[PDB]
Amino acid sequence: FTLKLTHVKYDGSWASPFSYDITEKNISGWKKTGLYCAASQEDNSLLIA
Amino acid sequence: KVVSGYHDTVNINQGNTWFIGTSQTEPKKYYWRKADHSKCQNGRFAAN
Q1: Under a CB-based contact definition with an 8 Å cutoff, are residues A7 and B18 in contact?
Q2: How are strands ordered across the β-sheet holding B2-7?
Q3: 3-class secondary structure per residue, A16-28
Q4: CB-based contact A34:A49 (threshold 8 Å)
Q5: Contact, B4 vs B20, CB < 8 A?
Q6: Closest Cα partner for B5 from B47, B33, B45?
Q7: Which residues make Cβ contacts (< 8 Å) with residue B25, sequence separation at least 6?
Q8: What are the chain B neighbours of A4 within 8 Å (beta carbons)?
Q9: Does B46 touch chain A (CB under 8 A)?
Q10: From A49's CA, which of A14, A19, B17, B36 has a CA 20 to 30 Å away?
Q11: Distances (CA, A) of B10 to B5, B7, B40, B41, B45
């Protein structure tokens, strides 16, 4: 499993996606998963889950 | 962001410093600059 992440550039094109290896012995084991994503007003970052 | 550099001469107050910069993309794109120390007095590089 891989998490991929991209964004719009100023000219409306999309950046080449970053990737993060996600598979750790458990998401392979889930069934019907779903992902969550939200920015943070404190400590500007992305909480992905 | 600058990855690595190499200074031209042996006295770091002279010569040029070549830099290798990479981009915040994927794959990365590598760039190069040069900082001419012959335009550097008081640790302040001239903008040119």
Answers
A1: no
A2: B2-7, B16-22, B30-36
A3: CCEEEECCCCCCC
A4: no
A5: yes
A6: B33
A7: A15, A16
A8: none
A9: no
A10: A14
A11: 14, 7, 16, 17, 18
Chain B residues within 8 A of A17 when measuring between CB atoms: 26
Residue A15: CB atoms within 10 Å? 13
| Cα B18 from Cα B28, distance rounded (Å) | 19
Looking at chain B, which residue has its C-alpha nearest residue A5? B26
Resolution of this PDB entry, in A? Answer: 3.2
Q: Can you give the length of chain A in residues?
A: 49
Residue B13 DSSP label? T
**Core vs surface per residue B4-25: b (16+ CB within 10 A) or e:** eeeeeeeeeeeeebeeeeeeee
C-alpha distances (whole Å) from A27 to each of A5, A17, A19 are 18, 21, 16
Which residues from chain B sit within 8 angstroms of residue A7, using beta carbons? Answer: none
